DNA sequence: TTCAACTGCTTTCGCATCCCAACTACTTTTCCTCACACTTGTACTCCA
């Protein structure tokens, strides 16, 4: 069974409101172990086993 | 002694006007490159 989820970051933002949040990581403000599931661009490696709780993008 | 509006009730889980942008314009930011009018002698004879 296949399922698609639309991760969207313009869902809350007004058309006039400028850009607030950015895919990726922010430096010097760091939780580790997100890097087992996720990649440098904040997107998951494809082929990765996830469960409920696991991070799906940063 | 009756007509006519105001009346709560059908199930049982879970499903499911303001802003932005376009292209073409015109403009400013300045820094770099020279000319244009003025003047004393000297030169060629000038009139004595």
Swiss-Prot record:
It is found in: Nucleus, Nucleolus. It comes from the Eukaryota. Component of the RNA polymerase I (Pol I) complex consisting of 14 subunits: RPA135, RPA190, RPC40, RPA14, RPB5, RPO26, RPA43, RPB8, RPA12, RPB10, RPC19, RPC10, RPA49 and RPA34. The complex is composed of a horseshoe-shaped core containing ten subunits (RPA135, RPA190, RPB5, RPO26, RPB8, RPB10, RPC10, RPA12, RPC19 and RPC40) where RPA135 and RPA190 form the DNA-binding cleft. Outside of the core, RPA14 and RPA43 form the stalk that mediates interactions with transcription initiation factors and newly synthesized RNA. DNA-dependent RNA polymerases catalyze the transcription of DNA into RNA using the four ribonucleoside triphosphates as substrates. Component of RNA polymerase I (Pol I) which synthesizes ribosomal RNA precursors. Besides, RNA polymerase I has intrinsic RNA cleavage activity. RPA190 and RPA135 both contribute to the polymerase catalytic activity and together form the Pol I active center. In addition, subunit RPA12 contributes a catalytic zinc ribbon that is required for RNA cleavage by Pol I. Three distinct zinc-containing RNA polymerases are found in eukaryotic nuclei: polymerase I for the ribosomal RNA precursor, polymerase II for the mRNA precursor, and polymerase III for 5S and tRNA genes. Belongs to the RNA polymerase beta chain family. This is DNA-directed RNA polymerase I subunit RPA135. It comes from Saccharomyces cerevisiae (strain ATCC 204508 / S288c).
């Amino acid at each position: 069974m296949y399922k698609t989820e639309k991760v969207d970051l313009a869902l809350n933002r007004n058309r006039g409101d400028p850009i607030t949040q950015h895919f990726g990581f922010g430096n010097d403000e760091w939780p580790k172990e997100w890097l087992e599931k996720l990649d440098e661009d904040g997107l998951p490696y494809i082929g990765t086993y996830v469960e409920e709780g696991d991070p799906i993008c940063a």
